[PDB]
Each structure stands twice: as C-alpha cells, then as structure tokens.
C-alpha cells in the first residue's frame with residue numbers, strides 16, 4: 001500500500017527514492033518534506049470541489065480559438081441512443097434538455113444535473129459555450145461525423161471524484177584557499193575563478209600559478225578577489241575553471257557562496273567538476289554526481305565569527321525618455337540616478353533598471369530591493385523577461401512569479417515548456433517557480449500531465465535528474481490517481497522501445513514485409529497486447545488509445561525505423577481512430593520547440609482575427625532521445641503525391657498539375673474552392689513561419705498536405721538557418737494558389753496579402769518570441785546555444801527597424817523568392 005506507492009513512484013520517475021536519502025543533504029530532505037505537504041494539501045482541497053469544478057480539473061474543456069446539425073446522444077446504464085436537430089449556437093443544456101425529453105418519452109416519465117461525456121474519449125461537453133466552440137463538435141463539422149455523447153448524472157460524476165481520492169561589518173577583501181586536485185592532462189595546469197551575479201562579473205578573474213601538468217596537484221594559495229565580503233549579494237555565484245597551458249579546457253565547476261538557509265558557506269568544500277567542450281556562470285551550481293570518474297577541487301571558505309544574509313526588514317531600512325527605447329556608461333549613470341522616477345513613470349522598464357545597478361555594492365542593491373518591494377504588477381510579457389538568467393535575485397524572481405499568477409491554464413500551457421527550462425537556472429532546490437508550477441499542475445490534470453512528461457524526459461541528464469525526480473515525486477504525492485494513469489503510459493512506452501529495437505535489428509538481416517510480419521507477431525504477444533492497449537495518449541490526455549490495430553501498424557524505412565502505431569475504438573467510432581509515431585535514437589526537443597512556436601504564431605494570428613489554417617500536430621519528448629509524434633490523418637506528403645501514381649484519381653501529365661489533381665480527387669465539385677482557400681492560407685502561414693524560424697531542408701518528402709487542402713511541414717530537426725535561409729515559394733504551390741492557371745494575379749495578391757499581414761503581426765510580438773527563446777538557452781539544444789541564434793530571430797523579424805522599413809524590406813524578399821521560383 002505505502003511501499004507499493006513508493007516503489008510505484010520510483011518505477012514512474014525512473015529513479016529510486018532511496019537515492020535521495022543516501023545523499024544526506026538536508027536541502028533535499030527539506031525539499032521532499034515542504035513540497036509533499038504543499039502537494040498533499042492541494043489534493044485535499046481538490047476532493048471537496050463540486051462535480052462541475054471537478055470536471056474542470058480532470059476534464060479541461062477543449063474549446064476552439066445560423067445553421068442546424070444532427071447529433072447522437074445516450075445514457076450511462078442503458079445502451080439505446082437517439083438523434084436531434086440542434087443549432088451550432090445552441091448550448092449543452094439545450095441539447096441535454098431534448099435528450100432528457102426523449103428519455104422522458106421512451107421511459108415515459110433536470111438538465112442542470114447532467115454532463116455530456118464524449119463516447120470513447122476523455123472529454124466532456126458543458127458550460128456557457130455554443131456547441132460550435134467545442135473541438136469535438138467543430139471536428140464533426142469538417143469530417144461530417146455524428147457526435148456520440150453520454151448523459152452522466154451529477155451522482156455518477158461525484159462517485160468518480162470519491163474513487164480517485166488519495167554582513168556589512170565584514171569589510172575584508174573576499175578570499176578562498178586553493179588546496180589540491182585529482183585530474184588527468186598533458187605543459188602546465190592553472191585554475192581561474194571569478195564572482196558573478198547573473199551573466200555579469202561581480203569583480204575581476206583571479207588565476208592561480210602554472211603548476212606542472214602531472215598529478216593530483218597541490219597549490220595551497222590564498223586567492224583574494226577584488227571585492228569585499230560586505231559587497232557579496234545573497235545570490236553570489238563562485239565559478240572555477242581548471243585548464244592546461246604552454247590552450248585547453250579540462251573541467252568547470254560552480255557553487256553558491258551562500259546556502260539555501262541564507263548563511264554564508266563556511267569552510268572546507270570538495271567540488272566534483274563537469275567536463276569542458278572557459279568560465280561558465282550559466283552551468284549548474286551542484287557538483288557532478290559521478291563521484292568516481294569526476295575530477296575535483298578541494299578549497300577552504302574562511303570563517304569570520306555564524307553569519308546570515310540580512311533579512312528583508314534590515315535591507316528595507318538601508319533627455320530621460322530618449323534613451324529608454326544595452327547602453328553607454330554616461331547613460332547607465334543617468335538611468336541609475338533617476339531610479340525613483342523609473343518606478344513611478346516607467347514601471348515596465350524594471351528589467352532595464354536592474355541591469356544598470358551595481359550588484360557588487362550592497363547599498364545600490366539595498367536601494368534597488370527597496371524600490372522593487374513597492375513596484376506595481378507588470379504584464380505577463382514583462383514578467384517572462386524577469387525570469388532570464390540575468391536576473392538571479394530571489395526578490396526579483398518572487399516578483400516575476402507574482403505577475404505570472406494571472407496566466408490562464410491555456411496561457412500557462414503555452415509557456416510551460418520555457419518555465420520548465422528556467423528551473424535549470426535555479427540556484428536552490430526549493431523556489432517560487434517550482435512552488436507555482438507544481439501548484440498549477442495539481443489544479444489542472446492536463447498541466448500536471450504535460451509538466452510531468454517535461455520533467456520525466458530529461459531524467460537521463462545528470463545535472464537535472466535530482467531536481468526533476470524530486471518535483472515529480474512531489475507531484476505523485478499530490479496526484480496519486482493520475483500516477484497510475486501515467487504508469488500505464490510508461491509501460492506502453494517501455495514496450496514500444498523493446499519492439500522498436502527488434503524492428504531495427506530485424507531490418508538489417510531480413511526484408512521489410514518480413515520484419516513487418518515479425519513486428520506484428522511481437523505485438524500480438526500477451527504483454528504487448530495489454531501494454532499497448534487502453535491508455536490516454538501522452539500527446540493528448542483527452543485522446544484515448546484503445547484497441548491497437550496490429551495489421552495497420554508498421555515503421556518507416558529511415559535510419560531510426562520510427563514505428564507507425566494505429567488505434568481504433570468501438571465506443572468512439574471514427575473519432576477513436578488515431579495514429580502515433582514512436583521515435584527513438586533522435587532528440588525531438590527541437591521539433592517540439594519549432595511546433596510550439598508555429599502554434600504560438602497561429603494564436604497571435606487568430607487573436608488579430610486571422611485564421612491561416614495551421615496544423616500544429618502533437619510532438620512529445622518522453623525519454624533519452626525518445627518521444628511520440630501525432631499522425632495527422634487524411635494527409636500525405638508532396639513526394640508521395642508528386643509520384644504521379646499510376647491509375648490513381650490524380651493522373652497528371654506534368655508535375656505542376658499533380659498537386660491540384662490530388663485536391664480535385666479529394667475535394668470534388670464546389671468543395672475545391674474551399675480546399676484552395678485552405679491551401680492558400682496555410683501556405684502563407686507556413687511560408688512566414690518557416691521564414692521567421694529559418695527552417696531549411698524543405699523537400700517534398702517533409703512537406704505535407706491535408707485532404708482538406710491544408711499545407712503543413714514536418715521534421716523540424718534543423719532551425720534558425722543551421723542546416724541564413726531566404727523566403728521560399730514553390731511553383732507547384734503558386735499554381736494551386738492560382739486555381740491551376742498560369743495567370744491569376746487576383747488570387748496571388750490576396751495570397752501575398754496574407755503573407756504580409758501574418759509577417760507584420762509577428763513583428764509586433766517580436767519580444768514574446770525573443771523572451772521565450774531567451775529562456776530556452778537553459779535547455780542546451782545544439783542550435784539554441786548563444787546570442788547569435790537569438791540574433792537570427794531579431795534579424796528575420798527586423799525588430800531594430802520600424803514597420804515601414806521591415807514591410808518594405810519583406811516585399812523585396814517576397815519578390816526575390818517569386819523570381820527564383822522558375
């Protein structure tokens with residue numbers, strides 16, 4: 001029971017709980033206890049919520065960002081069903097009323113006491129929303145399906161809730177002693193060091209002497225820095241970089257001069273260093289957990305008495321506009337001088353002010369903190385900038401979190417990826433971000449679900465394993481029922497990896513149709529049939545992966561042999577037919593980030609009243625170079641369509657005609673003008689999106705098109721011009737945009753109009769894209785590793801330029817892409 005839950009949580013996080021105890025770090029012991037209570041309390045509150053409020057936790061409504069329609073409905077106990085005529089603008093209650101009246105006429109004798117469960121899905125229909133706003137109904141429109149719903153009474157819903165229950169006086173120049181080592185290299189060895197607050201240095205870099213290349217060296221040098229003990233900030237960081245010289249980095253190590261309880265770090269410290277794959281302030285402040293092979297640096301932090309960092313109470317007592325839109329020294333002085341009026345008249349310039357203050361001056365810092373305490377709540381966009389590595393202070397961070405509490409579950413969900421990456425900056429295990437995320441995660445099952453997998457995937461990384469395992473453990477104490485749902489997924493993912501290795505070996509000896517049959521034999525085995533069937537999709541907790549259709553399952557013949565897994569459900573009909581791509585051996589983190597952005601562009605466009613028919617399909621990294629991808633049904637690649645396949649409905653003489661012929665065959669009659677509008681809008685957005693993000697290697701094999709006419713791109717392994725990518729236009733698309741005519745300038749200017757509208761809309765939001773890409777420098781993706789990668793986004797959107805200049809410059813780029821297009 002208790003051991004079962006503990007051994008289940010270890011099974012789930014992929015790390016033994018005992019490994020946390022064996023450290024004997026009281027910070028860790030303190031984190032597990034504080035959080036467990038926090039998380040446990042959230043579950044207690046959650047058990048007293050009303051059935052409709054419970055549905056908002058467990059079944060978050062999936063909405064869309066005069067005409068009637070057919071709809072099927074039924075009840076829980078009985079299996080008989082009925083159909084109705086209802087408006088797109090009608091409410092769930094209106095639908096539930098006719099459903100109640102039809103049962104009241106068949107049964108022969110209160111809509112507010114029912115909820116419409118989508119059959120064979122983890123979705124419900126309720127609230128003050130017109131039937132059109134629901135994704136499941138909006139889906140039934142384009143597919144022409146019959147919505148099948150179950151009338152679940154308030155009593156039955158509460159039965160599910162029940163069954164799912166669980167100081168300044170020290171004015172000496174700061175110094176430390178450098179004792180001995182235990183490393184390998186061959187020359188002479190040196191040890192640089194330095195103090196930091198964020199990216200900036202608190203003083204100068206003090207190197208040691210050139211001891212010869214050969215040992216477990218001994219220096220025993222008192223390294224005295226160019227800064228006083230009184231001038232050290234609460235979040236002072238001390239780096240170390242060991243290297244050889246006659247140029248060669250060997251290892252790096254960082255640590256906080258203060259502890260988590262605010263006390264200055266005393267005496268003797270052994271630092272287990274990480275390799276290099278010169279000085280790295282961004283890197284984690286905890287030591288390498290591979291104690292055996294990891295080299296080290298033993299040092300002494302001199303004592304000075306039990307000294308603690310001053311409490312708040314103590315600190316509390318201690319041509320202007322022209323430049324406020326980096327800066328000079330005479331300007332830095334002006335900004336700092338005027339600091340009072342920046343609070344009063346320019347509160348949203350806080351981030352700019354914090355950068356001009358001297359963090360190596362406890363007076364400037366006390367006066368800065370003093371102002372910051374009485375600063376007003378900034379916007380969510382401004383708060384995201386305050387979570388940058390440049391703002392390490394806790395008071396700043398705690399205030400940034402204060403301003404992100406207003407995020408909706410959907411706005412939180414949009415930024416969640418970046419919020420998990422900021423935890424990699426965090427100096428102390430317990431923090432407000434962790435407190436926030438975890439609290440929000442326990443308030444919404446979809447946020448908890450998605451946060452979980454964001455943590456769970458990076459467990460194989462040593463720098464975060466401890467941090468993330470602890471947060472996940474906490475979540476499982478708070479979400480005991482969801483933990484089981486998540487295990488079923490883990491077991492499925494566990495099998496998928498085993499099955500995929502088989503398929504990878506098999507393909508090297510045998511052939512594809514044999515491997516395919518061999519693979520299906522493995523799937524039919526007892527453990528695989530139970531493990532891969534019946535589970536909520538990791539890509540979408542509302543989709544249910546029920547019966548795995550083994551005959552339809554396969555893999556693509558491409559290096560990593562990605563598995564193609566297909567599902568079906570009797571209870572859902574066609575809505576229960578869903579496919580997933582399991583990938584292993586490649587990192588999908590970049591693909592998820594490229595997709596997150598495309599989806600954000602669709603939101604910012606949709607918010608300005610512009611729907612460019614984008615297809616931001618699910619992609620979820622779940623483990624070590626492991627993840628799932630969502631199969632977008634009723635779609636095929638341009639290469640598979642351009643084949644110009646023999647005796648198909650799209651037989652064409654030339655390549656240009658292949659595309660449009662495919663659309664005529666999938667959208668006959670009046671349906672084709674809708675499909676070309678769909679194609680034009682989606683193409684505009686994907687032309688703009690791939691241009692802004694710089695997505696190269698765009699061949700017909702990785703560009704797709706839906707049977708509805710919507711264009712979409714796949715395989716986002718290379719972004720930000722890291723194969724300077726130009727704007728791209730293919731003649732085969734221009735031809736379709738032009739309704740299959742060599743000259744339809746009428747349509748072409750509408751198209752060019754969408755590319756111009758879209759492009760400018762994103763420039764107005766250029767800072768959001770920059771603010772979110774700035775927090776991803778924590779993640780460590782090969783192509784999001786420096787300011788030069790952020791410079792691509794600044795340049796592509798042209799933020800330094802005005803609207804007039806950027807649009808004029810973009811029209812030339814658009815024309816240039818049109819000239820190169822044959």
Ligand SMILES: CCn1ncc(-c2nc3c(N4CCC(n5c(=O)[nH]c6ncccc65)CC4)ncnc3n2C)c1C
Pocket residue numbers: 554555556557564581591617629630631632633635636637640714715716
């Ligand atoms: C990063 C990888 N990635 N990202 C998105 C995707 C991806 N591929 C597809 C797809 N495909 C592309 C591959 C096609 N295909 C083929 O031409 N030969 C095949 N053999 C076996 C299976 C599939 C085959 C079938 C249609 N159809 C629908 N959605 C998709 N998504 C999200 C992919 C594959």
